[PDB]
Amino acid sequence: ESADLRALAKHLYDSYIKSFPLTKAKARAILTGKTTDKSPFVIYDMNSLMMGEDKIVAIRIFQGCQFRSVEAVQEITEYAKSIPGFVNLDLNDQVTLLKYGVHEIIYTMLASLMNKDGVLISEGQGFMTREFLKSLRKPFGDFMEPKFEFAVKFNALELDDSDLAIFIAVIILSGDRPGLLNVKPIEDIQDNLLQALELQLKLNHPESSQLFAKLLQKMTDLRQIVTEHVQLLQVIKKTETDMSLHPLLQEIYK
Amino acid sequence: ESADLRALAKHLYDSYIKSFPLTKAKARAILTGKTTDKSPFVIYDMNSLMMGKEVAIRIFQGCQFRSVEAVQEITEYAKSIPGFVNLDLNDQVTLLKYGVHEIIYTMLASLMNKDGVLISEGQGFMTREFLKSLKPFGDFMEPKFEFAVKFNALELDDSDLAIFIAVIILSGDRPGLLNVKPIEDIQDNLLQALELQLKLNHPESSQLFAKLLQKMTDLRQIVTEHVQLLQVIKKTETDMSLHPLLQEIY
Ligand SMILES: CC1(C)CC[C@]2(C(=O)O)[C@H](O)C[C@]3(C)C(=CC[C@@H]4[C@@]5(C)CC[C@H](O)[C@@](C)(CO)[C@@H]5CC[C@]43C)[C@@H]2C1
């Protein structure tokens, strides 16, 4: 029944709101001209960066990004438990689903905080220029550019948070993940999520032909962001042996 | 209108049949569904191979020969896809150039099971195990088998694969495209036709459309990882003025 799919949509949307403090809706309200009830401070060069510390180098911008990632992971983890059936899966598979799904999700949601020109930071208080990031030294000025390229095409799908809630759930419950003990219960859950997403996209974007297929295709764009990111980390780990990574993040990488 | 989608679906199936000699229906018959009338010669070891200038290289090289054949058959097929020839010529070239690898692994799944791949005409069969028994070359075919095993579990037939292949060609995110709009316009139409096809041809296979699209992510990095050992091979085969005309064809 349609009815059951809508109810799952609603449930997932409700949990999404509860798990993620900075929604796409809030982020698009900050980025635009809109509703300057609170506009961001902007980082476009290094001494506006010094001014930034005051009302809100290549290393700490990275270490800072590392922080928002580990906190993002803990948030995605909270959301996953809300996915029906998820906590009932074998514990090893829960861990495995989180290991591989977490970065694909981080870059899906990061797009919400991005436009062509830059990215919101510190829960929206801040905004860091794409150009400033691209100008960073040696192995760091490279990190954010492919995320920006993805975000610009992903953002043109014009998804809202209730669409994203279901898409994110679909991503966590893959089944094609390396080392899954128990693939069939995982796929039963995903088929359910896919039915739900499909209905949601059709109802929320009736004029948008084949948005479902176009959104699913976007998943290969995510895969290769992760891939580039991972190998880039391996470089930095060698050029700066004094710089430390976060164990939680480290455990995620294999 | 469901009529035009169905019309499009039949068109591609017909075109697919004329462009590709060895169909999936045919290859399945020959394979382990055993059609036992003319058994294919089997290659399981070095001496059955010989019974078929350096073994491991020359297998990988024979692998290039048929892919070059495949490219031309795919090229012909693409030209039958409604709207394709009306596209900008550079865009047509671009679409084939970036799509042809994904199509090749896709169709190659049709010639594969968990134990090996139909070789040549289908008059041959090379065991998976003889293939992993190799140099740097032992890891060439294994990721294709792994993909094929999952892909084949979807139990698509030729009528399904016909539209799927068309969707792959008309992507729209290929680098260097000049006019993305008519390409996506066509792929949208192809995606609708594929959806209808799967619902009629597999009415009890839930969310098969989505799962098939999910496979495209598997194809792309299969391709991406393949180009990465495609050319550890230039770390291997290097200097000799014997193939420069042959070097050219590939
Ligand atoms: C044994 C040898 C030398 C001649 C016969 C045979 C065969 O299987 O029919 C053909 O040349 C086909 C390919 C190339 C062959 C083996 C695997 C390749 C292979 C699967 C090798 C991997 C390549 O990436 C692709 C997929 C082409 O991209 C090709 C497609 C064509 C076939 C099936 C065979 C090579």
Residue numbers in the entry:
A (entry chain A): 207 to 262, 277 to 474
B (entry chain B): 207 to 258, 275 to 356, 358 to 473
What does the report in the manuscript say about this coordinate set?
PPARγ is a crucial regulator of glucose and lipid homeostasis and an important pharmacological target for treating metabolic diseases. PPARγ full agonists are strong insulin-sensitizing agents. However, over-activation of PPARγ can lead to serious side effects including weight gain and steatosis, for this reason PPARγ partial agonists are more desirable. In the present paper a series of previously purified and characterized saponins and sapogenins from Medicago species were tested for their ability to bind and activate PPARγ by SPR experiments and transactivation assay, respectively.
The MTT assay test and the transcriptional activity test performed on the most affine compounds (saponins 3, 6, 7, 8, 17, echinocystic acid 18 and caulophyllogenin 19) indicated that 17 and 19 did not show any cytotoxic activity at concentrations up to 100 μM concentration, but only caulophyllogenin 19 showed a partial agonist activity towards PPARγ. The final omit map showed clear electron density in the LBD of PPARγ where one molecule of 19 can be easily fitted. The ligand was accommodated between the helix3 and the β-sheet, where its carboxylic oxygens formed a hydrogen bond (2.1 Å) with the NH group of S342, belonging to the β-sheet, and the CO of L340 (3.3 Å), respectively. The 16α-hydroxy group is H-bound to the CO of G284 on helix 3 (2.7 Å). The 3β-hydroxy group made a H-bond with the hydroxyl group of the Y327 side-chain (2.9 Å). Moreover, there were extensive vdW interactions between the sulphur atom of C285, on the helix 3, and the carbon atoms of the rings C and E of the ligand. The ring E was also engaged in vdW interactions with the aromatic ring of F363, on helix 7. The position of 19 in the LBD of PPARγ was very similar to that of the partial agonist R enantiomer of LT175 (pdb 3D6D26) and also to that of the fatty acid 13-(S)-HODE (pdb 2VST27), a natural agonist of PPARγ. The X-ray structure of the complex PPARγ/19 showed an accommodation of the ligand in the LBD between helix3 and the β-sheet, typical of known partial agonists, where it formed H-bonds with the first strand of the β-sheet and with helix3. In fact, the X-ray structure of the complex PPARγ/19 showed that there could be additional space for the accommodation of the glycoside moieties in the region tipically occupied by full agonists, towards the helix 12.
